[PDB]
RNA sequence: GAGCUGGAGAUACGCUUUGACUCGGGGAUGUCCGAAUGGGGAAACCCACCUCGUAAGAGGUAUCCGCAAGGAUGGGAACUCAGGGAACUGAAACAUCUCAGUACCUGAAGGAGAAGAAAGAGAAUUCGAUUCCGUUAGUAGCGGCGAGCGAACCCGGAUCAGCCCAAAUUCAACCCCUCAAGCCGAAGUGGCUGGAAAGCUACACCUCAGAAGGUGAGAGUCCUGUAGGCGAACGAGCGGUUGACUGUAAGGUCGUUGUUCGUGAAACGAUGACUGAAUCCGCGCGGACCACCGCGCAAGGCUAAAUACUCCCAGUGACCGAUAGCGCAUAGUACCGUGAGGGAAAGGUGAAAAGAACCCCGGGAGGGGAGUGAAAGAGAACCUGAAACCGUGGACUUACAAGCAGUCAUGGCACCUUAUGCGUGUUAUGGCGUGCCUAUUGAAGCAUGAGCCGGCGACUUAGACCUGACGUGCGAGCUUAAGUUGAAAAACGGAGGCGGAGCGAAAGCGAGUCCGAAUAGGGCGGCAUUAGUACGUCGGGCUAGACUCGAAACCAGGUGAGCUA
RNA sequence: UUUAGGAGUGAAAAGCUAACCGAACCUGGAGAUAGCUAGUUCUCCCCGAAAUGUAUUGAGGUACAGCCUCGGAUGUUGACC
RNA sequence: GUCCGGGAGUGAGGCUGCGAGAGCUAACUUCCGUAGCCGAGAGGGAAACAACCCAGACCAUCAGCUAAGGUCCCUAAAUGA
RNA sequence: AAGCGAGUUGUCUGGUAGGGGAGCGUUCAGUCCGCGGAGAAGCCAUACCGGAAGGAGUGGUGGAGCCGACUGAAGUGCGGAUGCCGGCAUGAGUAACGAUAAAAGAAGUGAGAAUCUUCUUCGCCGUAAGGACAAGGGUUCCUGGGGAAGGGUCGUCCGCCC
RNA sequence: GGACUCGGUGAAAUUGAAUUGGCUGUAAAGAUGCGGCCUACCCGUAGCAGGACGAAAAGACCCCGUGGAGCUUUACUAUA
């Protein structure tokens, strides 16, 4: 019995293998963007750090 | 008999190693505060967590049906001496002959044999291999 | 499963009711004054068969302090006596002995006294 | 079978060996109530009116459907639905929600009804009759977008069987075959401590049949089972050929319930008022619609077999032990009482009572002699029988000495289960010294819990819920469903998922990768690289009350208002 | 003798339904659930703390991190001078 | 010097030193950090008494010395200069 | 053939939530040649050893079995949860015998008699604490009979019990 | 008429345990077992309240408790 979370099942959930898991890094989109340059080429898996245990019963069984 | 031993048919074999532990039972030994008996422990069937944050926030992306994500068959030991067990229905060993959705190629380069395939594939991956290794085109669909 | 203890805890009582020495009453078969008086009994008796030297300790200091002052005698200023021989070392138990022989101290006086110069 | 009908086993009374004594099956006297129903109608109780008849008293009275008789309705512990419908909880509170259609009410029949042969599932341009679990998918979706509920795509077997509204069943002979009374069923003993010892010892016999057990000490030659097989009159019961019968006449709109779908970006069950069109290469939908395909055709049901159930009859399990286990090892006695509704506590003498004549105090209860008793420190409210409290004496100390208690400390009376100036049963007194549990920063407290005895004494139990130590299986790895065997099994078994190159919203890409005008960067096959995985006890956690208990409050049903009115 | 439960009675007190009704009792729905709080059983060898910060309709509630034990590890990087 | 992990605790302390904050520089009141201490170990000194001077232990010996504390007594230790 | 250390130096600190780790033993199960009649298991007590828990020497008594090593399983173990029942408690022999609305005695009896019985004297009620009908208890009333127990003394009185 | 002579019956609320005198002091400061000091021949019963932080339900006055119930108001809102 898992009821894996689909909602934070979206997002990053694929696993990597023997190194580091990712994330998303997530700045602020939307409007009144008309400034910032750096992070618009950084966005996808923003990995966090490591807090990464929370998010496991959001899935872990057949992807 | 009898008179100064204690066995007499082995079974006494013992071992050479273990495998069990200490084992618990929870609220034990008849001591311990143990853990917080407010809600957690008993029940409380949500994580043992926080709750459903950090989780909101990103606009979602959806596409996850099963559609297709593919395997692979490695490519590395079977263009060299294998000759004869690898068509698109005998090999099933590594769940291959299961049918339906694609196997795609994806192999390497160079190539100093070669081998036959009952292919039904024509990935842009093993474009480094797909005649150095050797067996026709036929495009399936 | 199963299992029905209600024998098997008679011994245990017993096998710490060994202390049902003369306490009071009758606080040798009790079930109460017992398992408790036995706490009771469970103190200072871990170290009380050492820490007793501080009471047996209460005796050479009125005998070894000054006996036969029809010498002079000092025991504290005088300790630096003792340990004026060439070799005094020891001290004690010979204290316990000195309970005999009154002459341990005769010719063991003037002998450290004046052993300055 | 020949003897005597259940516990105050009842003395007696009485019957025997062609049917007393117990009984197997087909029947019968069958009291008030139960549907019972003549009426009354508060179970054990009062009335009319007709048939009968020596003046007395005998045959009977109530509703529904082919209707003019009759046939039926009764009470039910778990199996399907239907009328059926809240709710404490969770989301750490909190109206959509989880519980769910669950508690309860009411209707049905068999111990089988329920879906089950169709305007169908699937999807490569396949496949037929329901359900269950096996595996998937614990995916898609759902969704105060929150916990959460959760198919179809590929899988096993029981089953892979026909027909229904307007152009088979009923009595019986025979029967593989079940049901209680019941029939036989095996094979040697002596001596001791002692209750005959099956313990010490001795030898043969019985064998497809050697599980539990009774007779004073565990017995194959004392005996009931087990292997071998039998039993009628009555009938069912799973029946096999056949005799009396005849085996082939509605989509839709708007408001919504369900379905996984909280209903909206979606057809599909159906209802509240409106539309009864199509009408055959016409018609139902593939999740709204366009185009083409796929399959099925208004129109009514039967389908046994497995899935899910557990009142009874043999047999079977690493449970309890007669406050243990259901409350019942013969009581849910009496009852608690305002009412439906709540209930005990309690077992045991040895094989067997042989539970006992005979003189005493005494009213007797209770106690003497002495047999009984192998054994009466079982003992006619009875095994062994530990304990706070409670019964007496004694070797020793003690009121003139102070602290719940303490341990040692010289003495002090006793003893010497080893003269060995050494110890056993101890005390005036000395250092001083404040208890335990245990929610406490915190005390030694007056902070609280505690008179004691006997037990109950809880994070575990099923769950591929998961991660991880060790031992092992394998390096190309490991299996579910039960089908065959069947007092173990088991190989057979790729339903199947996890490991697996990855990244990417994904598409798709690719051993390399999202950026776009792209040697500079985060992850990856990669890699000075484990590519592993299954079983078990086990670190935390998880789906559940599942660590238990202590709350007034919300509900369905039902009970009297003789309490105040 | 009907009235009854979320109604009746009622001289209103917010009195009563059977010795407590701020909405009867009993069988039944779930143990109301519980961060409250009592407790959670035989005897142990070596190691070891927070009331500090960030979070909170959040406070003696709870999350995590410095803070403990253990498997692996860090081939010169330690702190003192 | 050097991280990954199975699992904690229970968040609400006290005091002397170091300085302020509300403050008749008052309060084992209250906020803060910094060493120690008691929440997890006993004593001498301190009359006995959590942070104060000295000192934190393997069980047993009526064996020795150091620091504090004392050198008149009730219970140690020169009314020695 | 499951890993073990003296010789030695620091650590061996004391430890509250915790980590790695050993066991005493009872019930279920394996192997039972078995252990017990001189009688074990039930229990009462004696200075051997053990890290503690506990294992040991013997009788006592008791009456029929019982545990063992290698092993897994089990509702495996606080006296202590103001718990619950069962029993012993102590408040302690005191307060109290009930509405304070008088009684003495002769004598029957016998086990002694103060409260029975045959009875002369006293007094309280007598719109009562009379008798019948109403509900109720169902066995009250009698021929009477016995103390185990009850009537909160007890008793040769009951409407206890036959 | 109860408190005292005598015959029988004698329970409950409660509670760790009494070689159960006091000061002044000390202690989370309301100490009798602690400090230091003084003091009593031990016991029985009548009687009395200062005494154990007297007893009973774990204050129910209050606060904390993302407790309940109850009533009202145009509180958000269902609804005959």
């Known amino acids: 019995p898992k009821m894996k979370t689909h909602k934070m099942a979206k997002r990053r959930i694929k696993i990597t293998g023997t190194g580091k898991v990712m994330a998303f890094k997530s700045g602020k989109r939307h409007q009144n963007t008309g400034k910032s340059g750096d992070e618009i080429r950084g966005k996808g898996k923003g990995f966090v ?15 | 008999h009898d008179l100064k031993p204690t066995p007499g048919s082995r ?21 311990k505060g143990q853990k917080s008996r407010s809600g957690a ?7 043992g967590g926080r709750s459903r944050l950090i989780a909101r926030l990103p606009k979602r992306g959806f596409n996850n049906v099963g559609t297709t994500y593919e395997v692979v068959k490695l490519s590395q030991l079977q263009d060299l001496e294998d000759t004869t067990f690898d068509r698109d229905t005998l090999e ?15 192999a390497s380069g160079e190539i100093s044999r070669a081998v036959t395939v009952h292919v039904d594939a024509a990935s842009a991956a ?10 026709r085109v036929v495009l399936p669909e | 499963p199963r ?3 209600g024998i098997v805890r008679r011994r245990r009582h017993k096998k710490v009711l060994k202390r049902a020495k003369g306490f009071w009453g009758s606080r040798s078969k009790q079930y109460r004054n017992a398992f408790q008086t036995l706490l009771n009994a469970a103190t200072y008796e871990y170290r009380d068969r050492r820490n007793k030297k501080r009471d047996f300790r209460r005796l050479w200091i009125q005998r070894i302090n000054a006996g036969a002052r029809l010498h002079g005698m000092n025991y504290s200023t005088f300790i630096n ?7 005094d070392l020891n001290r004690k138990v010979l204290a316990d002995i000195a309970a005999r022989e009154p002459e341990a101290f005769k010719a063991l006086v003037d002998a450290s006294r004046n052993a300055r110069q």
């Open chain 2, 126 to 135: 093993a474009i480094k291999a797909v005649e150095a290794a050797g067996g």
């Open chain 3, 3 to 5: 299992a029905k203890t």
């Open chain 1, 49 to 63: 750090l490591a807090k990464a245990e929370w998010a496991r019963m959001k899935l872990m069984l057949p992807r």
């Open chain 3, 81 to 87: 006596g003792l340990k004026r021989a060439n070799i």
């Open chain 2, 11 to 31: 079974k006494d074999r013992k071992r050479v190693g273990r495998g069990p532990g200490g084992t618990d039972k929870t609220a034990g030994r008849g001591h």
């Open chain 2, 92 to 106: 099933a060993y590594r769940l291959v002959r299961r049918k339906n959705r694609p196997v795609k190629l994806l």
């Open chain 2, 41 to 47: 422990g008993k029940g409380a069937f949500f994580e």
